[PDB]
Amino acid sequence: YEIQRERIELGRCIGEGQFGDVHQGIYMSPENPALAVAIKTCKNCTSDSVREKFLQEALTMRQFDHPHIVKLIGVITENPVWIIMELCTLGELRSFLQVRKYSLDLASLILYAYQLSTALAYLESKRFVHRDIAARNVLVSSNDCVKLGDFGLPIKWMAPESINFRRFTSASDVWMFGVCMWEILMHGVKPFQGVKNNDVIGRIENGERLPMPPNCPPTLYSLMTKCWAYDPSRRPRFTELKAQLSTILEEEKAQQ
Amino acid sequence: DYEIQRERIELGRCIGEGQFGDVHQGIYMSPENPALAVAIKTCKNCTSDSVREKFLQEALTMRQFDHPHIVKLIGVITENPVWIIMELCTLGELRSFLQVRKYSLDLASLILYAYQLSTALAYLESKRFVHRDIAARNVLVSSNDCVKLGDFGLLPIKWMAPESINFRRFTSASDVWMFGVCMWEILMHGVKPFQGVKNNDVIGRIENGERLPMPPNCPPTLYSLMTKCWAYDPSRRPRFTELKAQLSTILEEEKAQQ
Ligand SMILES: CC(C)(C)C#CCc1c[nH]c2ncsc12
Ligand SMILES: CC(C)(C)C#CCc1c[nH]c2ncsc12
């Protein structure tokens, strides 16, 4: 919904998005007392083509209602164009995992993988294909809560059919999810560091896969390997992934 | 932790309908204590994660409380079908109870129920908890002399304070307005407020200064207390400490008259 600019107080810059800086701020509505929010800005939204692309993310996001998907609060469609969203105070997942590398237990890493699998099972139930599942698109709401935060080529995360044929399906999202799980267990390290994008497909074609992260339970790595079946029809769906991640998380909690 | 094994619950008959689904009575076989009759809240749409979160948040809310006039949380079953296990109030829903006992309940019993609910609400106020859905439909009857606030799941326009209707603002003051409506329902033996009036016409009447009339046999002191609950300005409404004290005095005056 359209928000009056007077109801938004722009605060500190908290990140840099594809369209411009992201700020934290305050939304003052008659409904709720003053609420801390995130504000996506758009440097070049004076251009109608750029504005259409920027605002398309808000249109997509408004369709969802899930505990692990960031909520759209509203939009300001007059220049400067702003998207108002739910604030995830701990910020981007990659930076969070890198900073907390030796303070986050394995059970926390598996929990994040599980939570994202519930958001993705929800998207799958709505026949929605994300096309860009990666740790860089996840936000941290609290130490125990992550959310899919961006609905705006990444060769290193892509399923072979997406690279080869530009085919993006529920099965290609599962491949990308497997890469995202690897990134979480690697504490925010990017896949195939130093490898050229053009060499990635060749290695993948040859049967090579991202290695087991240190301290990753073998059951969880077996789940990642299933996400990376070359044949998309052999990849699990999110119902099975969610169920398996829940069992893996319970086994880790029981161990510790 | 409040997780209970499903094998320890024997699901019995349906005893009512809640916001999330049917409520059943059943039996809880705890490891140490004797078999206990319990109420089981079910959730028709808990396959939806958003709905499941809301349903389980009611149990997490109820877990925070311990009061003689608030239904006790016994436990939860977090696997599908998701259930909330709670204290069973054998006489059931307050509205049906007041309607059936319309010619057998004395005024002192009606005032006692208003007083008991005011003690549960003073307790919730002491914990800075805003209910947002105070209504006779959310009250259960434990015995002829004991009522309990029974639901914490949450539009109830006909019970709502004007700021809640106009601005979606819910505060301790808006709960007092709703409590005033609940007191009116009790004194009316379970008749709903504004029967036949459309929800959209409610705000217009309130803003013309219209209020629910004095129930027959309601002591003028008690109706004066309901009118204070319905001050348009939220800052002019009493708090539950004052309401509890005034209801206690009114109950004692009725008992003395009898
Ligand atoms: C990843 C990046 C650039 C920080 C972003 C963004 C959009 C956003 C939505 N909510 C929220 N909370 C913290 S950043 C953010
Ligand atoms: C809590 C709610 C939804 C008002 C209900 C109900 C039906 C019911 C009858 N007896 C009883 N005891 C505990 S809940 C219940």
Side-chain angles (χ1 to χ4, degrees), chain A residues 199-242:
Chain A
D199 285 57
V200 174
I201 193 67
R203 291 167 77 120
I204 296 294
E205 282 292 348
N206 191 46
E208 297 176 35
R209 295 297 184 272
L210 290 162
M212 180 168 79
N215 297 288
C216 175
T219 54
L220 185 50
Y221 183 65
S222 189
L223 204 59
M224 292 177 193
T225 67
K226 289 154 82 160
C227 294
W228 308 321
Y230 186 91
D231 175 357
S233 77
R234 295 282 303 166
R235 300 178 200 145
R237 277 204 180 276
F238 289 105
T239 297
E240 174 184 330
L241 289 166
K242 181 181 164 180

Side-chain angles (χ1 to χ4, degrees), chain A residues 108-241:
Chain A
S108 283
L109 302 186
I110 304 164
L111 175 69
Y112 305 150
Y114 171 75
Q115 291 178 344
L116 294 165
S117 83
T118 71
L120 296 164
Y122 168 78
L123 290 182
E124 178 187 65
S125 79
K126 306 288 186 190
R127 301 185 178 278
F128 179 82
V129 181
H130 189 277
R131 301 166 60 108
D132 192 34
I133 297 154
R136 66 176 175 271
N137 290 331
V138 180
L139 298 161
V140 188
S141 184
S142 69
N143 279 336
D144 317 287
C145 179
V146 297
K147 309 197 179 202
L148 182 52
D150 193 286
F151 289 84
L153 293 157
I155 297 301
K156 296 168 181 173
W157 285 254
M158 288 163 67
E161 70 274 10
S162 303
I163 296 163
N164 290 323
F165 311 109
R166 304 174 196 96
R167 180 100 171 116
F168 290 88
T169 69
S170 69
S172 70
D173 273 3
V174 166
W175 176 289
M176 303 191 94
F177 178 62
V179 182
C180 187
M181 285 198 287
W182 185 95
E183 292 182 279
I184 295 165
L185 279 286
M186 286 296 296
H187 308 273
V189 163
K190 287 176 180 179
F192 306 106
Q193 277 286 92
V195 179
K196 292 133 72 202
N197 287 343
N198 285 34
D199 285 57
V200 174
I201 193 67
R203 291 167 77 120
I204 296 294
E205 282 292 348
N206 191 46
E208 297 176 35
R209 295 297 184 272
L210 290 162
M212 180 168 79
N215 297 288
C216 175
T219 54
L220 185 50
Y221 183 65
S222 189
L223 204 59
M224 292 177 193
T225 67
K226 289 154 82 160
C227 294
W228 308 321
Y230 186 91
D231 175 357
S233 77
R234 295 282 303 166
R235 300 178 200 145
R237 277 204 180 276
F238 289 105
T239 297
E240 174 184 330
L241 289 166

Side-chain angles (χ1 to χ4, degrees), chain B residues 14 21 74 81 87 93 105 109 235 240:
Chain B
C14 176
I74 290 165
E87 174 187 358
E93 301 161 89
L105 282 168
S109 284
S235 81
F240 289 105

Side-chain angles (χ1 to χ4, degrees), chain B residues 15-18 23 39 41 86-89 92-93 137 140 150-151:
Chain B
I15 61 167
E17 294 179 37
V23 182
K41 291 184 145 157
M86 61 190 216
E87 174 187 358
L88 177 67
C89 293
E93 301 161 89
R137 67 177 175 272
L140 300 159
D151 191 284

Side-chain angles (χ1 to χ4, degrees), chain B residues 26 67 70 77 103 136 142 157 160 207 230 245:
Chain B
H67 190 268
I70 300 177
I77 304 176
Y103 313 98
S142 184
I157 309 290
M160 288 165 58
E207 283 171 349
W230 308 323

Side-chain angles (χ1 to χ4, degrees), chain B residues 134-158:
Chain B
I134 298 155
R137 67 177 175 272
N138 290 329
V139 181
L140 300 159
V141 188
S142 184
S143 70
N144 279 336
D145 317 290
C146 181
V147 296
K148 310 196 179 204
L149 185 52
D151 191 284
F152 289 88
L154 203 138
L155 296 158
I157 309 290
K158 294 167 184 175

Side-chain angles (χ1 to χ4, degrees), chain B residues 154-193:
Chain B
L154 203 138
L155 296 158
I157 309 290
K158 294 167 184 175
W159 285 257
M160 288 165 58
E163 67 276 8
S164 304
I165 294 164
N166 290 322
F167 311 110
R168 303 179 167 266
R169 274 211 292 281
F170 291 88
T171 69
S172 66
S174 70
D175 273 3
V176 165
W177 176 289
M178 303 190 94
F179 178 62
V181 181
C182 187
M183 285 198 286
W184 184 95
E185 294 182 276
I186 296 164
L187 279 279
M188 288 294 286
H189 307 273
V191 164
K192 287 175 177 188

Side-chain angles (χ1 to χ4, degrees), chain A residues 14-17 22 38 40 70 85-88 91-92 136 139 149:
Chain A
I14 61 168
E16 185 248 36
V22 181
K40 291 188 114 177
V70 66
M85 38 204 43
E86 159 183 16
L87 180 68
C88 295
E92 186 224 23
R136 66 176 175 271
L139 298 161

